[PDB]
Design an enzyme around this catalytic site. Structure first.
Site, PDB file in Angstrom:
ATOM      1  N   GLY A 189       0.814  -1.202   0.000  1.00 49.65           N
ATOM      2  CA  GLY A 189       0.000   0.000   0.000  1.00 49.65           C
ATOM      3  C   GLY A 189       0.849   1.253   0.000  1.00 49.65           C
ATOM      4  O   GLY A 189       1.936   1.306  -0.589  1.00 49.65           O
ATOM      5  N   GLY A 190       0.356   2.273   0.701  1.00 49.09           N
ATOM      6  CA  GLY A 190       1.003   3.572   0.672  1.00 49.09           C
ATOM      7  C   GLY A 190       2.439   3.547   1.148  1.00 49.09           C
ATOM      8  O   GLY A 190       3.197   4.484   0.886  1.00 49.09           O
ATOM      9  N   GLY A 201      23.244   7.928 -33.845  1.00 48.12           N
ATOM     10  CA  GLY A 201      22.725   8.662 -32.703  1.00 48.12           C
ATOM     11  C   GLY A 201      23.229   8.146 -31.370  1.00 48.12           C
ATOM     12  O   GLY A 201      23.395   8.921 -30.421  1.00 48.12           O
ATOM     13  N   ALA A 202      23.467   6.837 -31.273  1.00 48.29           N
ATOM     14  CA  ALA A 202      24.040   6.271 -30.057  1.00 48.29           C
ATOM     15  C   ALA A 202      25.369   6.934 -29.712  1.00 48.29           C
ATOM     16  O   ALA A 202      25.651   7.199 -28.540  1.00 48.29           O
ATOM     17  CB  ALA A 202      24.218   4.763 -30.218  1.00 48.29           C
TER      18      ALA A 202
END
Ligand SMILES: CC(C)(COP(=O)(O)OP(=O)(O)OC[C@H]1O[C@@H](n2cnc3c(N)ncnc32)[C@H](O)[C@@H]1OP(=O)(O)O)[C@@H](O)C(=O)NCCC(=O)NCCS
Ligand SMILES: CC(C)(COP(=O)(O)OP(=O)(O)OC[C@H]1O[C@@H](n2cnc3c(N)ncnc32)[C@H](O)[C@@H]1OP(=O)(O)O)[C@@H](O)C(=O)NCCC(=O)NCCS
Ligand SMILES: CC(C)(COP(=O)(O)OP(=O)(O)OC[C@H]1O[C@@H](n2cnc3c(N)ncnc32)[C@H](O)[C@@H]1OP(=O)(O)O)[C@@H](O)C(=O)NCCC(=O)NCCS
Ligand SMILES: *C(=O)CCCC[C@@H]1SC[C@@H]2NC(=O)N[C@@H]21
Ligand SMILES: *C(=O)CCCC[C@@H]1SC[C@@H]2NC(=O)N[C@@H]21
Lengths: 506, 210, 506, 166
Positions: free
Chosen positions: C165-166, C400-401
């Site tokens: 949960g939170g 581009g790499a």
């Protein structure tokens, strides 16, 4: 002198009569026609009309075309200054060269210096192969400047043809990307390599067409029918937006009244808890004149984001949509909303949020995909904001989702609730199942306890008694309240702690 | 084989010496609240050597070290070894020794006189708390070799009816102009081969069976 | 007073002898034992030992437990000040209440004030249901402070039990998350709701265990065998990190030499372009003493990220890894490297990059998943960096790499290349097939043109002739050059334009 | 709903008819009447009408009055923005409690954030004894904010009844 008018007329033709007529046959406008439609009449001033490339490899010294495949300059839109560039598909397929990149860099630099918006129009094919590594260098210099401009001036991208390879990473770092249906597409690697490597056969439309990028991939913020429609909508968008991160939102004279009530809103929420409603109706009834410009409409439709005006000033809107996946928050919606909130905060646009959320979307597909960080993006964006925030809970607000949706605990200034609001940790059934775990066998006790829990807790009044809600309002007053609050909150002054930058999850 | 007698004692002493050198260096970090010269180093240590506890005491003498055991036995330790070097060569108790040193999380792996052992050095309380930790079992692999990447089979080495150890090269699968060597993660015999040299596979396809 | 000693002795027992024995039987330490193992001996000062809850609903008033389920305070690690908190599973399942949250808020505020690191240890169950909306409020106040501390002080999280949960969104906004194998797990919605909604049956280990979160989901930065190993590694990590965004990296005396040469590196690149090598070997030979703390080692293994030391000062490392997916760049790897680069820039840690990259990964899966933006994230991160950046190209750098991997065009300070480097737009075969499209009818001309293209352009010398590379170096000199450059670059001062924050894509 | 307007009308009464008529008998206006006189017609927006205390000592849980003894909000004076709070003497003698103090702190924070003036109207008897040290805590948090606002926004105080101790 006649010779100069002749050289101008010769530079305007680009790659030739035939290629231009063929562009017209594809249903596409030329670069200069696009510029002419975007800018106010007579306002365009062009830079660098006579620039030429300086490559000598592969015979390129024999095809020197003035302008080198891009048109650059500045003008006005509704009287306000803008800078722009437009790629020319007839010249070497719109490919980027050294001098081409330098033309784009000049206008990027000028836009940052003047603190004015910049619009880029893309119809291209990437790095020009014959020029080799030099061309790559060019692209780099463009990228850097995009990053320098982020959160200082608004940057808009319009994709009106092909955009492949390195050409895609510039629009990606801008604030908005828009596409034209059936004539544009984007991808990093093209279909031929896809076939060689993955053995799958796909067309360019199937790999990167507008449907894919507006409904599946998260890339595009909208699509239009044709070039003319798109450009006119860009003119519409610019009127909403600030010119930079200092001047604030533009103001126009409104024909609407900030004190009008709306009785129909008292019947929007159905009595049956399982029946949905259209939050877009509420949004379109709250804004001035019913005018609303939606962002990422076709993607993650369990949430709504867009621009409207209140009292003639621009305001951003975020809302849960019960019609789609019961309005739950998932990863896609959280990303869609987080980007919008961050943009609004950077350029000093106030935000109004409408909340009806039962929780997050369960399952292995969501957890394996990284919901833990994706959902946190939105919480981070709201908690970091210093602009005015106004939130209205309409029907449901359960659990951590209640926290994430512009709660007072994360920094909202004003928090209102309708009479039908349910603010709680979780639904009554599960709540009592957990609390009364040692008594689940019975069936009368369970129903009694469920009814009692629903009566005590699924309402706006425990949150009201703790001050988490500033007032419980009547639906028909909503607009009247919003306009007032915003008016008061214009003087808000707040600062985050001093830092190079945050470390928001990615 | 795990060490015994003087060998094990020498290994434990070398382990304590290494730990002491590293602690000394550690305690010089910048940015401390107050001067480190005013803090104390605990003299009692527990050397754990693949499940054989030695309670020892460490004392600096001159520039070398002295390690005392429970039997009253003492061992002086002297070397010019520095972190990064793969061999500890020095003197432990009137006997010159060379020991192979490798690193591991929170300790070292030591080899000497044909014996090999993991070595960890704790304080008494750290050792008490470490003794609360269980010994976990390994599950093991699943009887067959599955291709973890799509590609083309370039070479199959082993044959049917062939027992294998770990780290054994079994096949090569090329993808995107790059070879990838597949290895055995268990031991066993090769029953049948399902893939042929030159074939083309998808993810989670079967190459061979154990 | 003896009676106060008794009060303390009773507060130290949490939820009972039986529950603590059961925790031990699971092979798990207690909260206070964990705090004891993390901090230097005798340094722990505790806050708020006697705090109690004030709820009166559902019979809670009859069971008030001192501490309210969390142990909070401060101490020293290797002499340096650190704040911390540790949740106690034996008290209402470590669930968060109003007062519990107030304790956590106290230590968070103090840590921001003193500009010191903060460590959180999680073994919990979320918001205490019996307290309703108040519980949620608490979570919010914690979240806000997380966001305020991002990029100002380092925030470390250690998951040593259930987190549901939170509770999960607080670690998600911290800098690093570490887990313990076979006893810890994280998810937003648990197995029961998953069963009721999706009809899928799944255990907690399957839904959110260490393997899922270290190999598939992008959430966890690493996993460890048991609690003791994990806490000792947290102590190790703290000695690399700056205390805050002003003080800079810690310094220690090194046992290594900066002028040593490494002959073996001259034979690391294979003659055959189809054979790979292990980049981790290069990294472990370059850093001081062979000591390297890897981050996200089990996720996106086509790239490597982590911390080492040079001349006794901390340095971050990013490197392509040919052994996995041929070293290509994909979405996962890009996000991994981008978060790491952003952290290092925020806390003034210098970055060293090793480049061997053929391109990006093709296929509809990547494009539909959003590679345009995910790839743009890393480009953004590098372009925005103002710390020193040193890059070394070993073998391949195409398209581009090449631009994305800390090229001079996006702001790198120094750029070296080994003799085996190949810096080009793409491979010779495809370049030829494009430039000579209307000639492919032959087979011998093809081979001749390909060979001459290889000879001219697949090398480091065109980039050197253009000044994109500062020097071609011999491999054995790598360390010596790096150590020198970094020294010189310690006085770098640069700043980005003024803005509230950037609008990096999400 | 009509029930909501009923709840509003029931919160506007404070400590009851008889105490309000006694206040009038002394020649004193009510807190809400004072707000109505200070602000421009139709401008008052109220915060936290339904806030209640959470004490369970000395039989306090049997008397929970909405508002907890203070009326808070904002409005305009001659068109210019102002924030304000007014204490209600008919609710525990306008004594200060935890939630009371929280309401005042909210309006103080907002006034500093928006850089506008703040007006406090006082008719009260100090820290609510039944709540013990918690009440004192409230007072503290208010004090600090006064000091933060000094020389930044103008702060005006009107004493219209008793004002003792803290
Ligand atoms: C941009 C693209 C998607 C458009 O495809 P299309 O509309 O079918 O048209 P074409 O490929 O015929 O392109 C138009 C022209 O621009 C040229 N061009 C396109 N991209 C170019 C580039 N990067 N460098 C140089 N010239 C380029 C083409 O060669 C062609 O010229 P031509 O009419 O003189 O023969 C495609 O050309 C492309 O992917 N370009 C990138 C480079 C590449 O890898 N090409 C090989 C895959 S086809
Ligand atoms: C956290 C959790 C995963 C741990 O599971 P577990 O180790 O199997 O153990 P349990 O759930 O039985 O928890 C230990 C105790 O803590 C209590 N506890 C756990 N989480 C709690 C929460 N959020 N609020 C209040 N109490 C809680 C449980 O009631 C249980 O009490 P008991 O031993 O006194 O009966 C699980 O309890 C859970 O998911 N909790 C969250 C709340 C919830 O939704 N639970 C319903 C489904 S389990
Ligand atoms: C404020 C004060 C000066 C008003 O005098 P007064 O108008 O003559 O009226 P009272 O003293 O009768 O007060 C009015 C009511 O408020 C209550 N009240 C006043 N101050 C209170 C406080 N600090 N805490 C709780 N209740 C308080 C009184 O109990 C009384 O309630 P009741 O009328 O229902 O019995 C006086 O009540 C006072 O001095 N209070 C301060 C606290 C204190 O030290 N008082 C000691 C006794 S005087
Ligand atoms: C009753 O049938 C309850 C099961 C459905 C619960 C729904 S699914 C999406 C929301 N998230 C959550 O945890 N509960 C809500
Ligand atoms: C030869 O078979 C050419 C196809 C392989 C090209 C490789 S695949 C991964 C790299 N990215 C890219 O686009 N080209 C490279």
């Amino acid at each position: 002198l006649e010779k100069l008018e002749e050289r101008r007329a010769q530079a305007r033709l680009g790659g030739g009569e035939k290629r231009l007529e063929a562009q017209h046959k594809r249903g596409k406008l030329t670069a200069r026609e696009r510029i002419e439609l975007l800018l106010d009449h007579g306002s365009f001033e062009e830079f660098d009309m006579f620039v030429q490339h300086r490559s000598t490899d592969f015979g390129m010294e024999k095809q020197k075309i003035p302008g080198d495949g891009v048109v650059t300059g500045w003008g006005t839109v509704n009287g306000r200054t803008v800078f722009l560039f437009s790629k020319d598909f007839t010249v070497f397929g719109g490919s980027s060269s050294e001098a081409h990149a330098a033309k784009i860099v000049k206008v990027q630099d000028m836009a940052l210096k003047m603190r004015a918006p910049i619009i880029g129009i893309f119809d291209a094919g990437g790095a020009r192969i014959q020029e080799g590594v030099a061309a790559l260098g060019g692209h780099g210099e463009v990228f850097r400047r995009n990053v320098a401009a982020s959160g200082v001036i608004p940057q808009i991208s319009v994709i009106m043809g092909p955009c492949a390879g390195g050409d895609v990473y510039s629009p990606a770092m801008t604030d908005f990307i828009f596409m034209v249906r059936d004539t544009s597409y984007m991808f990093v690697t093209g279909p031929d390599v896809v076939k060689t490597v993955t053995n799958e056969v796909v067309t360019a439309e199937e790999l990167g067409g507008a449907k894919v990028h507006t409904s599946k991939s998260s890339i595009a913020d909208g699509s239009f029918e044709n070039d003319v429609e798109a450009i006119l909508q860009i003119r519409r968008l610019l009127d909403f937006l600030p010119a930079n991160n200092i001047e604030g939102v533009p103001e126009i004279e409104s024909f609407d009244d900030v004190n009008r009530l709306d009785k129909s809103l008292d019947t929007l929420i159905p009595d049956n808890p399982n029946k949905p409603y259209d939050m877009g109706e509420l949004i379109r009834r709250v804004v001035d004149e019913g005018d609303f410009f939606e962002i990422q409409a076709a993607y993650a439709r369990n949430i709504i984001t867009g621009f409207g005006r209140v009292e003639g000033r621009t305001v951003g809107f975020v809302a849960n949509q019960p019609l789609v996946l019961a309005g739950v928050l998932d990863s896609d919606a959280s990303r869609k909303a987080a980007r919008f909130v961050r943009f609004c905060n950077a350029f000093s646009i106030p935000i109004v949020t409408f909340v009806d959320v039962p929780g997050f979307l369960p399952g292995t597909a969501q957890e394996y995909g990284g919901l833990i960080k994706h959902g946190a993006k939105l919480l981070f964006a709201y908690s970091q904001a210093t602009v005015p925030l106004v939130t209205i809970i309409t029907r449901k607000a359960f659990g951590g989702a209640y926290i994430v949706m512009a709660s007072k605990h994360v920094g909202a200034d004003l928090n209102y609730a309708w009479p039908t609001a349910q603010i709680a940790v979780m639904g009554a059934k599960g709540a009592v199942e957990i609390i009364f775990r040692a008594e689940i066998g019975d069936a009368d006790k369970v129903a009694e306890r469920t009814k009692e829990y629903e009566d005590r807790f699924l309402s706006p009044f425990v949150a009201a008694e703790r001050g988490y809600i500033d007032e419980v309002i009547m639906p028909h007053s909503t607009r009247k309240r919003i306009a007032r609050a915003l008016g008061m909150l214009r003087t808000k002054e707040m600062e985050q702690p001093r830092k190079k930058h945050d470390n928001i999850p990615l | 084989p795990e060490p015994e007698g003087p060998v094990a004692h020498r290994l434990a002493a070398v382990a304590a010496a290494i730990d002491h050198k590293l602690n000394i260096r550690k305690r010089g970090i910048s940015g401390q609240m107050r001067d480190p010269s005013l803090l104390t180093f605990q003299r009692e240590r527990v050397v754990v050597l693949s499940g054989q506890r030695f309670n020892v005491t460490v004392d600096p003498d001159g520039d070398d070290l002295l390690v005392t055991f429970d039997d009253g036995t003492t061992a002086p330790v002297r070397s010019a070894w520095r972190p990064g070097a793969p061999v500890w060569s020095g003197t432990v108790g009137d006997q010159s020794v060379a020991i192979q040193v490798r690193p591991l999380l929170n300790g070292v792996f030591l080899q000497h006189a044909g014996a090999a052992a993991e070595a960890r050095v704790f304080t008494r309380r750290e050792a008490e708390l470490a003794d609360l930790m269980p010994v976990k079992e390994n599950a093991g692999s699943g009887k067959q070799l599955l291709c973890p990447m799509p590609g083309l089979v370039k070479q199959i080495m082993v044959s049917e009816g062939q027992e294998v150890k770990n780290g054994e090269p079994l096949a090569i699968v090329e993808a995107m102009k790059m070879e990838n060597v597949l290895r055995a993660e268990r031991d066993g015999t090769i029953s049948k081969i399902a893939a042929k040299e030159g074939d083309s596979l998808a993810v989670d396809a079967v190459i061979l069976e154990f």
